[PDB]
Amino acid sequence: CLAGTRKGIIEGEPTCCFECVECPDGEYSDETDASACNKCPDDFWSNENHTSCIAKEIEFLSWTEPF
Amino acid sequence: CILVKTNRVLLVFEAKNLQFLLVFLCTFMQIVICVIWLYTAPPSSYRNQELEDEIIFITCHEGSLMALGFLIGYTCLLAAICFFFAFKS
Amino acid sequence: SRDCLAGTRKGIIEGEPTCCFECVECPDGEYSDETDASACNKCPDDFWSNENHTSCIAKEIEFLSWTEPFGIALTLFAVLGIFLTAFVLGVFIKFRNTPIV
Numbered sequence: 422c423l424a425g426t427r428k429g430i431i432e433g434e435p436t437c438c439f440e441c442v443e444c445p446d447g448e449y450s451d452e453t454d455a456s457a458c459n460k461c462p463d464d465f466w467s468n469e470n471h472t473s474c475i476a477k478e479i480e481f482l483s484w485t486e487p488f
Numbered sequence: 489c490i491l492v493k494t495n496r497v498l499l500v501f502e503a504k505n506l507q508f509l510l511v512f513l514c515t516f517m518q519i520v521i522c523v524i525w526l527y528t529a530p531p532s533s534y535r536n537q538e539l540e541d542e543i544i545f546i547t548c549h550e551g552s553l554m555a556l557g558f559l560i561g562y563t564c565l566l567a568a569i570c571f572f573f574a575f576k577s
Numbered sequence: 578s579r580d581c582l583a584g585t586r587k588g589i590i591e592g593e594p595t596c597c598f599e600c601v602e603c604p605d606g607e608y609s610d611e612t613d614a615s616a617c618n619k620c621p622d623d624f625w626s627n628e629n630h631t632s633c634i635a636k637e638i639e640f641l642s643w644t645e646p647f648g649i650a651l652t653l654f655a656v657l658g659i660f661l662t663a664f665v666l667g668v669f670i671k672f673r674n675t676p677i678v
């Protein structure tokens with residue numbers, strides 16, 4: 422499996438055979454092989470490819486904003 | 489109609505039932521633009537799902553906002569002319 | 578291993594035979610309606626899963642309508658304007674012979 426995916430179970434087959442399934446939004450993985458998609462820390466959100474988490478963004482009417 | 493009943497509006501057009509003729513021409517310039525708009529890009533209903541993950545809204549895509557603005561803009565050009573003549577008198 | 582209940586999904590335990598596993602909850606946009614499911618199924622295009630990810634329930638349509646607190650108010654105003662204009666027109670008609678009209 423790649424860095425952005427996790428393993429899956431094929432019914433009636435040994436553990437050496439699996440499938441690669443994408444991690445959901447809000448979770449990430451950065452391993453060559455992963456059994457689970459690790460959850461993203463608080464105030465952090467997963468990237469588009471779910472490779473690694475990134476910090477969220479603060480929204481407010483700033484003084485330096487053009488408006 | 490309000491414009492045709494103003495102190496200094498009818499006299500200029502006369503000698504160029506005329507009141508009715510001028511009520512006809514402006515309304516005809518409004519009728520034509522709407523027909524052209526409908527034949528080219530008619531506004532219709534659209535279903536929006538990207539806004540909410542649980543509920544969906546039914547809107548009315550209005551086609552190019554250039555057209556909607558031109559209706560209001562033509563309407564204002566007439567109101568401004570009427571307001572100017574009435575203010576001078 | 579204990580069986581996974583409806584709304585859950587199987588998970589791999591590394592280094593162990595496939596008979597032994599763990600149960601993981603399904604995501605929000607998916608559901609599972611069976612026991613010992615290897616994956617969570619996706620709801621249809623116009624359906625959304627319920628709180629417990631066991632089924633899909635239809636979405637709610639939201640639009641401006643007559644039976645809404647905002648709608649009932651706007652209509653009354655339009656009918657009032659129509660009635661006022663009708664009253665004015667009926668007065669000019671009935672008093673057609675006055676010098677003012």
Ligand SMILES: [Ca+2]
Pocket residue numbers: 433434
């Ligand atoms: Ca087998």
Ligand SMILES: [Ca+2]
Pocket residue numbers: 592593594
């Ligand atoms: Ca082993």
